[PDB]
Amino acid sequence: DILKQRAKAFDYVFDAIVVTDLQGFIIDWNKGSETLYGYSKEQAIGQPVNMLHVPGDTEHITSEVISAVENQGKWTGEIRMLHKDGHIGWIESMCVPIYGENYQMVGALGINRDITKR
Amino acid sequence: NVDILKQRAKAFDYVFDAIVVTDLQGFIIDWNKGSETLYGYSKEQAIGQPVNMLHVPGDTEHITSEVISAVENQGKWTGEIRMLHKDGHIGWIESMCVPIYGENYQMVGALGINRDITKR
Numbered sequence: 001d002i003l004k005q006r007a008k009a010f011d012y013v014f015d016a017i018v019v020t021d022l023q024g025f026i027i028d029w030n031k032g033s034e035t036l037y038g039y040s041k042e043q044a045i046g047q048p049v050n051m052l053h054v055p056g057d058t059e060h061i062t063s064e065v066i067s068a069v070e071n072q073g074k075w076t077g078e079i080r081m082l083h084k085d086g087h088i089g090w091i092e093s094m095c096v097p098i099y100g101e102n103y104q105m106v107g108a109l110g111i112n113r114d115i116t117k118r
Numbered sequence: 119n120v121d122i123l124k125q126r127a128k129a130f131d132y133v134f135d136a137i138v139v140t141d142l143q144g145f146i147i148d149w150n151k152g153s154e155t156l157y158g159y160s161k162e163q164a165i166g167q168p169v170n171m172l173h174v175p176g177d178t179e180h181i182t183s184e185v186i187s188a189v190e191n192q193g194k195w196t197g198e199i200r201m202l203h204k205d206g207h208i209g210w211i212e213s214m215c216v217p218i219y220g221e222n223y224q225m226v227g228a229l230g231i232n233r234d235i236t237k238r
Contacts (some may be wrong), residue, residue: 010129017133
């Protein structure tokens with residue numbers, strides 16, 4: 001009910017939501033993400049989230065994200081994005097850890113918005 | 119599936135989008151951080167209040183009629199309407215509204231998604 005309605009906003013928001021597991025594999029994808037990145041839900045699911053990075057940025061972005069999430073509980077930054085068709089853009093990104101039991105991180109939630117024009 | 123619902127609901131208080139969930143009578147039943155940033159009110163000040171408190175006095179009846187009308191025809195409503203902030207200033211937002219349903223395939227209210235468009 002209450003939970004159901006909060007979850008429904010998923011495919012209606014403009015923000016691009018990317019849900020990943022501990023292994024960094026995309027497990028959920030919303031319509032906002034389909035618009036921002038180009039990949040359909042069926043295409044993104046199962047793929048490494050780093051697929052969304054400009055290859056050259058992956059190493060430093062990943063260590064920076066892992067550090068913030070584990071120490072501050074949240075990572076935020078302005079990074080480049082690699083679209084499905086190949087063009088590059090800039091996005092405002094946030095990563096929040098998802099917990100299982102006894103505060104055990106079981107995956108992460110990514111929220112993204114395009115800022116290329118700006 | 120509960121795992122799916124949980125993770126999807128999780129994004130609720132993290133998106134930039136202002137989500138406003140209302141009942142069949144337009145009273146706020148859920149409000150995320152995004153709405154607090156956009157409208158100025160916190161969850162404690164928004165939940166249980168009439169959603170028209172966010173409209174500029176004059177616009178209410180018109181907006182409500184277009185929403186209902188749009189939902190009955192297309193099952194969704196979208197529009198650029200004025201917004202009345204808690205601190206009293208007025209602005210414009212890009213808004214969308216779709217019906218939410220209970221467990222019996224019956225409408226129990228609405229889901230509103232909003233974004234500031236004031237500048238420009």
